[PDB]
Design an enzyme around this catalytic site. Structure first.
Site, short mmCIF file in Angstrom:
data_model
loop_
_atom_site.label_atom_id
_atom_site.label_comp_id
_atom_site.label_asym_id
_atom_site.label_seq_id
_atom_site.Cartn_x
_atom_site.Cartn_y
_atom_site.Cartn_z
N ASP A 171 4.83 16.34 5.24
CA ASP A 171 3.80 15.89 4.32
C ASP A 171 2.67 15.08 4.98
O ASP A 171 1.77 14.62 4.29
CB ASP A 171 4.38 15.20 3.07
CG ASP A 171 5.23 13.99 3.40
OD1 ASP A 171 5.47 13.19 2.48
OD2 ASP A 171 5.69 13.84 4.55
N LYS B 168 7.40 11.91 -4.90
CA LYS B 168 6.38 10.86 -4.92
C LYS B 168 5.28 11.18 -5.91
O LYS B 168 4.64 10.28 -6.45
CB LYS B 168 5.78 10.64 -3.53
CG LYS B 168 6.74 10.05 -2.50
CD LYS B 168 6.80 8.52 -2.61
CE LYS B 168 7.49 7.90 -1.41
NZ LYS B 168 8.97 8.10 -1.42
N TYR C 161 12.25 -0.06 5.63
CA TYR C 161 13.26 1.00 5.56
C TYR C 161 13.61 1.69 6.88
O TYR C 161 14.40 2.63 6.89
CB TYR C 161 12.91 2.01 4.46
CG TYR C 161 11.66 2.84 4.68
CD1 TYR C 161 11.63 3.86 5.63
CD2 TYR C 161 10.53 2.63 3.90
CE1 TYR C 161 10.49 4.63 5.81
CE2 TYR C 161 9.40 3.40 4.07
CZ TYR C 161 9.38 4.39 5.01
OH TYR C 161 8.24 5.13 5.16
N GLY D 13 11.84 13.92 -1.73
CA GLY D 13 11.08 12.68 -1.75
C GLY D 13 9.84 12.67 -0.87
O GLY D 13 9.56 11.66 -0.21
N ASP E 74 10.03 1.79 -1.11
CA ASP E 74 9.46 2.32 0.12
C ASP E 74 7.96 2.58 -0.05
O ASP E 74 7.50 2.92 -1.15
CB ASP E 74 10.19 3.60 0.55
CG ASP E 74 10.08 4.74 -0.47
OD1 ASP E 74 9.75 5.88 -0.05
OD2 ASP E 74 10.32 4.53 -1.68
N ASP E 75 7.22 2.40 1.05
CA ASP E 75 5.76 2.60 1.11
C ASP E 75 4.97 1.76 0.09
O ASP E 75 4.15 2.28 -0.66
CB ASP E 75 5.39 4.10 1.05
CG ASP E 75 5.96 4.91 2.24
OD1 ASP E 75 5.89 6.17 2.19
OD2 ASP E 75 6.47 4.31 3.22
C1 LIG Z 1 11.91 5.84 2.54
C2 LIG Z 1 11.21 7.06 3.09
O1 LIG Z 1 11.51 7.55 4.18
N1 LIG Z 1 10.20 7.52 2.22
C3 LIG Z 1 9.40 8.61 2.41
N2 LIG Z 1 8.52 9.12 1.57
C4 LIG Z 1 7.95 10.24 2.15
C5 LIG Z 1 8.42 10.57 3.40
C6 LIG Z 1 8.01 11.71 4.28
N3 LIG Z 1 6.71 11.53 4.94
C7 LIG Z 1 6.88 11.10 6.34
C8 LIG Z 1 5.53 11.04 7.06
C9 LIG Z 1 4.55 10.14 6.31
C10 LIG Z 1 4.46 10.54 4.85
C11 LIG Z 1 5.84 10.60 4.20
S1 LIG Z 1 9.62 9.45 3.90
#
Ligand SMILES: CC(=O)Nc1ncc(CN2CCCCC2)s1
Ligand SMILES: CC(=O)Nc1ncc(CN2CCCCC2)s1
Lengths: 461, 461
Positions: A227, A40, A161, A9, A116-117
């Site tokens: 990421d 994503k 979250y 994810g 999320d986000d």
């Molecule tokens: C619910 C939840 O944790 N969603 C996520 N999507 C991606 C993730 C990893 N990364 C962390 C640092 C910022 C970018 C994203 S964490």
């Protein structure tokens, strides 16, 4: 039942068939059980959640789902509609159902809804029909959950979250209150701890959030994710989470490095952590050692690097100096954790700054003896980093090497510039040469238009 | 029969199933015909050529070979034993046969033997049995060729595989003499032109090499390859090869960028080049325009970027500013060819160096008017590069974007440092601020241990 394993994810290139099948294999053999599909940047997972998967795209997911069944891994398909969904529109809810029906037909039996986000602001229409944001989300989640026959594994990911994401805080959140009350009891809630990337997940905050959501959460752990767009890599062990959390959680899923092969440690050490208190009842860590878990991981990972008669006057078999456990231990040290460099890498950093700080001591007697005694050991350490880069670049496993090759090339490049600088400092009471960045190889001999411009920037002067 | 298409024969991460199947699709629809399987880092292709492919590895190659059949692409399997083969040892020759038998059974009917990027020195045993290096190679090639029933498509890659690689030269090579004499006539010879990466493949040198090898060569073209370890990217059109070569060649296979999606132009423009003189008999270019071919390519490629109702009071569909043809034209310009930047990128480079050269004109009147008139247009150009980076990072196709994302991030980062520097130059007759690299974002806010060290290097002073 305890969900433990991996969530794909992150933002970035989604893994491919070959990689995911390999993940399932490794998960099975380390006694883990779960894979959450959440890329994503699978365009039809988030961005264009409404669209059906094409025939080609469908055969692939079917294969993927089949392989998970074959290796006894539970495949959870997630969807993220919260970017542009009109909750109140019945045509929308219908499409969400239609999408999840396609995936059910592919053979998937476990699902997740992710919010999320995204921003808190609902549209006009939704604001009429729904009390709050949480009310809109819970309504659509519950509906979907029931429409799909109330599956054994269904997950929900909040918008708030994690600790720092709750307005005004965790224990007094109107958003989390609603979720913990209105969301059906057969549904799991995902949580990442105090922050998105939690240094620690303290038992206290787990009880705190447990109270308001009115259930044990499943951790979506971002300890090893990379990421965030200033490229790092994490090969350190699973740390910061007390094994006491295990009986206080419904699961732990880890969202690891974007680079697939860079994740052996991350996933291995999590399995060790989970197995160390698998059965334990509800009662720094008395059951799990990050240091001993990293060693076990690197020991087994080394076996993944190895190679799959001629006469004295014949041609010698192709061979090269083998990667050693000590090499890997150094590699992990240099690319450790998000909030913590490894001991040796940290020590090298101190040394370099001390040497540069105290370089006047050799510009124009007892400090002179200490400085040289330190600059010696530093160059000797810089030499080891090169040493193991080379053994790494020569190994049999090219897939592993090329997954982290750019990271290894960068640090290797810096170390040499740093080694040269220390040497050049150590020789100035008998040398007239001026140091320039534009004299080196990684700065003055860099390819592409990007490099041509870079050379014209004010470096040194 | 004219072999035209792609050779996956670079150093680095080999492409995966998804990518290769997509390549076959595109090759078919652009009327190309050939795929040469040669990944230097498929461990069992070169390094460990003796080893059989495993069951899992076998199912994959079978699928791969099947897909090529499905899209009417001829799959040529290459092997490279020249790193550690004892030619004179009959057990070796037997194993080479055994390997190629496995692949035949997978469904492959066309094969290649590669002796590229190895040293000339034979072992003791081989030196007794064989007159020269070429004699050893031709002997084993011919044997294999005949043992496999003399297939319609069999390729041979020399050790002296290009102009600069022949001792003492092309027309008087003892190595190439032997090859052109002793190597059976039903076998193709691979050639890359005057150099490994040939700026031009002049018709003269093709006739020159044709004479000694005693046949028309198949080009293994490295115009677009980027596996040389100072990361560049080539999105320019196929240039430097006269369409007059087509009737003087048995084929052209292109060894493109390591990043898969970065290869639309490279492969598209080659098809245009090939189709422009498909039938033409033996008689700057009167049949093919690199500029017009790049435009056709980018025009079609743009369609690969595109996206696959709500009421005024409802939530607006997720959307973003679309990537335009002009954006891509700029992208290709900035990441053009190995021996040639694109016009606009080249012009930007001139401008930047002129501005920095003549920055005294604004340190402490007609030159002042010209300088500002130029620094304006430069910043306006720097702004466009950012502009199109952003549109690119927002597009629907994440696979394409993430294949070249690091390149786009690097140039985007430099442009801003450069823009700031020009601004800072343009304001010094009314500003006391000193410029520092350690004040910026890509240098002073860089992640990882690599960055911590980088900040401690002597930047600026
Ligand atoms: C619910 C939840 O944790 N969603 C996520 N999507 C991606 C993730 C990893 N990364 C962390 C640092 C910022 C970018 C994203 S964490
Ligand atoms: C026969 C032939 O050309 N073999 C090749 N292997 C790889 C190639 C691409 N790349 C060019 C630059 C140097 C590294 C290698 S070219």
């Amino acid at each position: 039942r305890f969900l433990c394993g991996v969530v794909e994810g992150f933002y970035g290139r989604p893994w491919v068939m070959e990689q995911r099948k390999e993940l399932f294999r490794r998960l099975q053999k380390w006694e883990l059980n779960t894979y959450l599909y959440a890329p994503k940047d699978d365009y039809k997972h988030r961005m264009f959640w409404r669209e059906m998967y094409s025939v080609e795209e469908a055969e692939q997911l079917m294969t993927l789902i089949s392989a998970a069944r074959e290796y006894e891994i539970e495949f959870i398909y997630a969807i993220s509609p919260g970017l542009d969904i009109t909750f109140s529109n019945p045509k929308e809810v219908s499409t969400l159902k239609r999408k999840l029906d396609q995936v059910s037909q592919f053979g998937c039996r476990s699902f997740a809804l992710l919010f999320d986000d995204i921003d808190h602001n609902m549209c006009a229409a939704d604001k009429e029909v729904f009390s709050s944001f949480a009310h809109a989300q819970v309504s659509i989640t519950n509906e979907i959950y029931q429409y799909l026959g109330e599956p054994e594994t269904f997950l929900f990911c909040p918008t708030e979250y994690c600790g720092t994401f709750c307005y005004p805080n965790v224990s007094q959140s109107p958003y989390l209150r609603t979720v913990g009350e209105k969301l059906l009891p057969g549904i799991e809630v995902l949580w990442t701890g105090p922050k998105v990337v939690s240094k620690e997940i303290p038992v206290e905050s787990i009880e705190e959030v447990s109270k308001i959501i009115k259930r044990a959460p499943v951790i979506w752990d971002n300890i090893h994710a990379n990421d965030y767009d200033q490229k790092r890599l994490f090969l350190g062990p699973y740390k910061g989470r007390s094994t006491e959390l295990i009986p206080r959680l419904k699961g732990v899923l880890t969202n690891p490095n974007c680079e697939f092969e860079a994740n052996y440690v991350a996933i291995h050490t999590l399995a060790t952590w989970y197995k160390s208190n698998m059965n334990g009842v509800r009662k720094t860590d008395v059951l799990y050692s990050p240091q001993m878990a990293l060693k076990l991981a690197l020991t087994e990972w080394l076996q993944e690097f190895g190679v799959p008669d001629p006469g004295p006057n014949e041609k010698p078999l192709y061979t090269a100096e083998p990667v050693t456990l000590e090499d890997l231990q150094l590699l992990a040290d240099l690319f450790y954790l998000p909030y913590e460099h490894g001991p040796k890498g940290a020590q090298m950093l101190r040394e370099f700054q001390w040497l540069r700080a105290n370089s006047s001591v050799v510009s124009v007697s007892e400090k002179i003896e200490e400085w040289r005694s330190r600059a010696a050991k530093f160059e000797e350490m810089c030499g080891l980093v090169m040493g193991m880069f080379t053994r790494l670049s020569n190994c049999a496993n090219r897939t592993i090497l090329y997954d982290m090759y750019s990271y290894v090339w960068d640090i290797k490049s810096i170390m040499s510039m740093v080694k040269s600088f220390v040497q050049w400092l150590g020789e100035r009471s008998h040398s007239s040469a001026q140091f320039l960045i534009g004299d080196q190889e990684p700065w003055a001999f860099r390819g592409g238009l990007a490099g041509e411009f870079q050379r014209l920037l004010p470096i040194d002067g």
